Scaffold this active site. Structure first.
Site, short mmCIF file in Angstrom:
data_model
loop_
_atom_site.label_atom_id
_atom_site.label_comp_id
_atom_site.label_asym_id
_atom_site.label_seq_id
_atom_site.Cartn_x
_atom_site.Cartn_y
_atom_site.Cartn_z
N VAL C 46 0.82 -1.22 0.00
CA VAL C 46 0.00 0.00 0.00
C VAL C 46 0.86 1.28 0.00
CG1 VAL C 46 -1.91 1.24 1.14
CG2 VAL C 46 -1.81 -1.27 1.24
N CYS C 47 2.04 1.21 0.61
CA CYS C 47 2.92 2.39 0.77
C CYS C 47 3.46 3.02 -0.52
CB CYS C 47 4.08 2.06 1.71
SG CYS C 47 3.57 1.52 3.36
N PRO C 48 3.84 2.20 -1.53
CA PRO C 48 4.29 2.78 -2.81
C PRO C 48 3.24 3.63 -3.53
CG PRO C 48 4.89 0.46 -2.70
CD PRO C 48 4.03 0.74 -1.50
#
EC number: 1.11.1.26
Lengths: 166, 164, 166, 167, 163, 165, 166, 163, 162, 167
Positions: C46-48
């Site tokens: 989810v972070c990218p």
């Protein structure tokens, strides 16, 4: 801590008085008689009758050199709205102090902690800042403004004439 | 420290909802999606646009099974008056929680201590009572209700469908 | 007990920014708008997408005089590897602050204590160091960078025009 | 913080009432309206006019069902002497509670610490023991007995009529 | 307050081992010889030579009935990435424990507080959970894996043979 | 809360070295490589193979500029007797520090409180007084002195070649 | 605290006695006269003369029913070695208790704190564990074993003959 | 811990010495050998034989350059009465210190608390104030004055002659 | 701990003496002998006989140079009233100190805590402020003024003749 | 805080009484009148006159049912010697308590801490253990035995006669 015969603590609150907002501090109470009139909340049933009775005697109070300060835990914005809305509040020419922090209320030992509202208490303060009379009542019991005048008149008499003969 | 992914604390407040007073507790939030919409004070200039924007999306929120709780440090008596007085407030069909004690506000770590008023903050809470999203803003900055719906729909998706 | 309208605490962290290691402190943020973009950990799904969406709007942010600071508990050595390996991370031209001690993450009250990772939280900070907007979300929920630009452009408008609102 | 809407604390004091000494406790005030009337000292100048005004309305107070308890830090022996000597005190038919320990006075947060005497304070207590009205004044200022009757009659009305409230 | 001849404290960490993540606790180490191999951080220059040396002797360690546990303050997600990228790390078949909380590291009193990373330390633990050997070095000095085997073989001898 | 990469605490202990008693303090270690070789007791059967192996490599250690300090809770009077009695101790040219108070031992966190004896530990200390390597072992397990030379040679390299290994 | 006429504290120490190691405890002193002969350290010059005297009188002590315990801060392994080397120590048939922890020495309030060695002190204990005589001297001064027997015989007389005195 | 090889603490007590009363302090003990001869109480049976013994050797003690101090929890008034009544006490020329507060007795750790009396202890002290020998006994066991001299002569030897 | 041979603490109490009210402090007792005569309360049965007995000997006391201070937990107002009403109290020409705070009474360790009254206690004090004699009695037991003079005369003798 | 009208604390002291040593405790004082006659030290000048004056009235005190306990910080051994030496002490037939610990003296708040001696104080104690009269004096000032009897006769009267009070 009995507050009778003790100096009032410093404060810094926002208020409503005759349309405009103003700041009121302990400096404004110096050299003049003051009445800190606490009540629980705005838009209630008992409070307009008490505040309205003080408004009827405000001309008499101003003549005696006495300021009035209506205090509650509502904001100064709410007091403006209540002044327009209610008829008995609209005739109030004295200041209506907002105390959302409860600082002014906690200085006078008058907050209901579980409710977050100030009790029905009236404090008569002299020019030096010393509390000369206190009158606290329950939620239902109303405060008479004619007795408040008798106390201020009596407090003014003893100040001007200390140690009267009998 | 951070309230994200933590259970909401118990509370007991009086509130105004559709011309009638009611008591609202943590028991009323159980088993349903909830939105605690904090704001500083009644009879102010910025609040009506925020609360009014949420009132416009209340049809959509109720369809998603989401309750809304407007909160401030004013009394429930004051919320009734502001509902009658203001026009943008008159369309609010959701509950308006009074918090004079500031207990509910202090449970959500959202109190301006020197002002005695709640900060502008929105909390999305799931049926289990866990805080899934937090928004906080300064006095001048407004909160968009379409971005709130985007987060609630995202929170509902991950709840029903974990791991994608 | 709220970090909104409070000054940021001092810090001293190592970071990765455009193929080289640098030390960043609170002194670097002085006199400028700042965005502290917290996230749990490197090499996650989810972070990218969040960091990539902010990377797309970094030209616009640098236009508005805004510095972005990606923060996580992972080291600055790990950020260099994640920048090389991943494609959505490679486009990040802003600083990736490492916070292995958790000091920066704890200054913003944003640490998962049992997990030892930062929560997904964005903090908008003004030139004086005062936090003007917070946005925290759960693990599953994503943060919209277009909404972040609205709050920065809002915050900049209120600073430049005192006694006004949005 | 504030003694309004709080239960009274227990006590045990000796008192003078109609030519005989008696012991009074919190048990005696149970299920009844009670007025605790504090004042500085006996053989003073302002105190007899205050107490004498309440003595004039004691016919009315008894009819409503209200106990009156005059309280000071002087002994109950002193109250008997002051009853005999002073004319205004002789008409009093209610209890004159002695409080040399100051325990009853301190229970109501009403002691002058540097002076060792009670302040001029009246407390209206209901059947359950809850303080429904407080009234404190400075040394010079006198309390009005007719205003006390208004507050008692108000308090009795609010208790007997739940929902209703006096303005 | 020395940690030699003392029981290890409980822990609950996530770890990477042979292309999958697993939870490791103190209960897994019980009834077996264990090696808690601490190191500062992933994607560093000198850590692959230490870990890779132990990876070469892991065949011999598995015969002796010894579990190796590589520990650092990085996440178990990071250990997966460092396994695929580096050749010297790719041959590690033992567990790579992530300790982002620093709890496992602080149990063994091995944390650099100002740096937020573990010191280069090797702890040999017996089936009862008692620490039988400690080896700690500074951040330029390597650790010989042949010396570690000698201590484990010595520890296993004296554990079986009383007096 | 370890003591790797921390400065050693001050001390004042009596020692035995080549047929004469001497007093050794932290000032004597200043600016030089030192090895504090702790062990439990004298006249024991875990033969001085540990102390003897270090004694065999003392000629190599003195070349590198390394002072060996054999520490124990036994007195300095004891170390003289154990030096004359035992063959493997007789070849020790380095200092044998006595620590009956246990002050030196408690500075390095190496005391067996229930036994009142030091643990089998080897601390490598650099010219600044900073501990660069630690090696603690159980009662039965020995310590290899050829391995100890590898740690000191590695420690000397990183000191004289900063920013690299 | 005065230790005279008080019960001895419990202990658990290793000791050397006639070519074998043993464990001595407070249980072993019960129902018997006991002597705790403290001294600084092994392989020194003054103590073999002190311990050699008590070794000569041990024939008489065993007749009277008195155990001797030679205590010091050195280990039980050292007491074995000192017994073989020195001639004056070789004739000791009584127990030589090792006290490396200092627990036994600290029970009798007899530790040199800055030196970590026991003071030159002799304690006489009766069958019930009560200390009947104490004798302490400086580093240079020696203790007379003929005087110790005279204290033991005086102590045994008063115990068997209550009321009478020496 | 032990009082051997430690400096004596300050005191200020009244004493009886050859008919007249006097005050004795630390300054009196300075630069001189001193013996604090403690005992339970006056008008008891065992005490006069012990104090009578040191009184016989007082000729030899003053020759060596030593001051004797007989100490008890009785008053200095009581020591004067006991000196007149008893024959064995009448020959005492040395100072009999009264210590009703027990300050001097507690400074030498020689108070039996439950009885409020001093134990039978003898403290030899050198010119610098350092306690060179202690000798404590139970109620029944008597102290030998010829032993005390042997300790003083041993203490004076090692002080004057090192090595 | 005992109050005999200790200096009196500072106080500031109001008193009644020969019609007029006055303030008395520790400064007023300096350089002179003093008698602090405590008693339970005014308008009681036993106290007039004790205070009247000291009033009879006040002629002799004033010759010896002693200031009598009658102390109780009642107010200085109450002492004036009691002086007018009773005949045995009317002959008291010495000061009647009022101690409603109980500070003077608590300085002398003489407070009945559960009753809030002073115990029947007499204290003889010298010019330096040191307490030379104490006499305390139970509720029923009276104090003899002839004994008090003997103590004062003895105290005055040993001060002048050390 | 005062010791008047308070129960005496427990104790265990050795005492000299008519040529023999005896142990005396709080149990022995129960159900009887007791006089704790404290004085500083033995072999002093002013103390014999006080103790001798009580010894003269001891026949009367025993008649009334009153026990005397002469207490001091000297030992019970010292009291025997002082009883034989001095003629004014020889006529004492009551118990001479020895208190070398200072436990009994500290129970009555009567210790000179810097001196380690008791103050000159007489304590009259009733059958229930309650202190009815205290009489402390300075080093030079003597205590009259005739006054002590007057206090004991007054104390005995009020105990046996509830309601009545002495002048």
């Amino acid at each position: 801590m009995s507050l009778i015969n003790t100096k009032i603590k410093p404060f810094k609150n926002q208020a409503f008085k005759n349309g405009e907002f103003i700041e009121i501090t302990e400096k404004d109470t110096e050299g003049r008689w003051s009445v800190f009139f606490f009540y629980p909340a705005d838009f209630t049933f008992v409070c307009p009758t008490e505040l309205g009775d003080v408004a009827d005697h405000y001309e008499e109070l101003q003549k005696l050199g006495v300021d009035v300060y209506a205090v509650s835990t509502d904001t100064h914005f709410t007091h403006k709205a209540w002044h327009s809305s209610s008829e008995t509040i609209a005739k109030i020419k004295y200041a209506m102090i907002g105390d959302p922090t409860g600082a002014l209320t906690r200085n006078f030992d008058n907050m209901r902690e579980d409710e977050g509202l100030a009790d029905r208490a009236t404090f008569v303060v002299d020019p030096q800042g010393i509390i000369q009379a206190i009158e606290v009542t329950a939620e239902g019991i109303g405060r008479d403004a004619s007795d408040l005048l008798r106390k201020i008149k009596a407090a003014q008499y003893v100040a001007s004439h200390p140690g009267e003969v009998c």
